[PDB]
Amino acid sequence: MNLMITLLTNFTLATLLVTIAFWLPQLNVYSEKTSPDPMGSARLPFSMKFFLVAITFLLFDLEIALLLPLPWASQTTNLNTMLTMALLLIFLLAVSLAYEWTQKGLEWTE
């Protein structure tokens, strides 16, 4: 309840600052301008490399999603199994990074 009141107050203050930032210089009657880039009129060239770094982020973020409950996972009574599977998850993240390395995946955005 207090969290939502805090979030609603933050959103209200942000909306108020944006509204003042868009309306206060529009109070000026400055001038209506006539005749309002490096590339002129080309289309956006698709870079495969930027898509590759975004997908590599998404997959490593899923591996991180597996990694997150470790501060609770250390509290278990099966510590050999927990330690093995924790090192196995971090090792599979390392193997994913190593395969990303060795197949020219991290090139020109290394």
Add this chain to the structure above:
Amino acid sequence: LHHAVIPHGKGGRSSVSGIVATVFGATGFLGRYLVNHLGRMGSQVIVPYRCEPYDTMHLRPMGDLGQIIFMDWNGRDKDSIRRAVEHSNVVINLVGREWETKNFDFEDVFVKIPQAIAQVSKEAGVEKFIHISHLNADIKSSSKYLRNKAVGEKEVRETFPEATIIKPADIFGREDRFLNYFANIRSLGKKTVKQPVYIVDVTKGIINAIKDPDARGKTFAFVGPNRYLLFDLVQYVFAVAHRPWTTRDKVERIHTTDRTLPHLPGLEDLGVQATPLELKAIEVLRRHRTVQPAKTV
């Protein structure tokens, strides 16, 4: 004729045109292109300004060194008017407002300021005077704008008898309030008939009224080549602009049909051929857009 005011040069920037002009109301829409066209000949252009000197910056590249003199003036101060016109050989009046303010109404802007400018210009010995009225100025008209502008036309005629009064219909350009009004309105269709005139045609008409000695004491009506209805004009403006502040006096003047005065001379009697709307409407409305032309009558 004084020696310093004989024309010299090939009519360029650094020449002397012999026109020593005072342009009242030069910090607006017509005074902009008029001071451009006078300064490209080499005229001494006195620009009396009422506003902040920041708002007269765009007039400064329009002439050569020393050719534009900015000086302060109040409309209700005859001393400032005499201080501005006592060296001119032509005075152009362009003071106008689409809206009436707290200190100035349509009466003071369209009657008192033009009559005081014309009377002080008469008693300062200025040879020529150009007054800018509206085509639809009428005493019995529905809008207070056109009523006070017809009265001010009458007073400018009676107190400066050799004045050159010019009647534009509805001027369109980049900084207008005619096509940019219709493009930003996003008011309705009627049987109102208009013929808009392009601003460079009006400005060449005012120059040719300065230069022609036969334009003294005459009255000119500057209209465009094509009479349009209101509805097909407004839909054409929304079509060129790729589209699916106001007051009631402006709306009553938009719905005022542009009268036809064939007994008054126009642009063709000053050597100006009126540019049609279909050449310049994309130049005006290219800013608004993120085509079959309009029907004439």
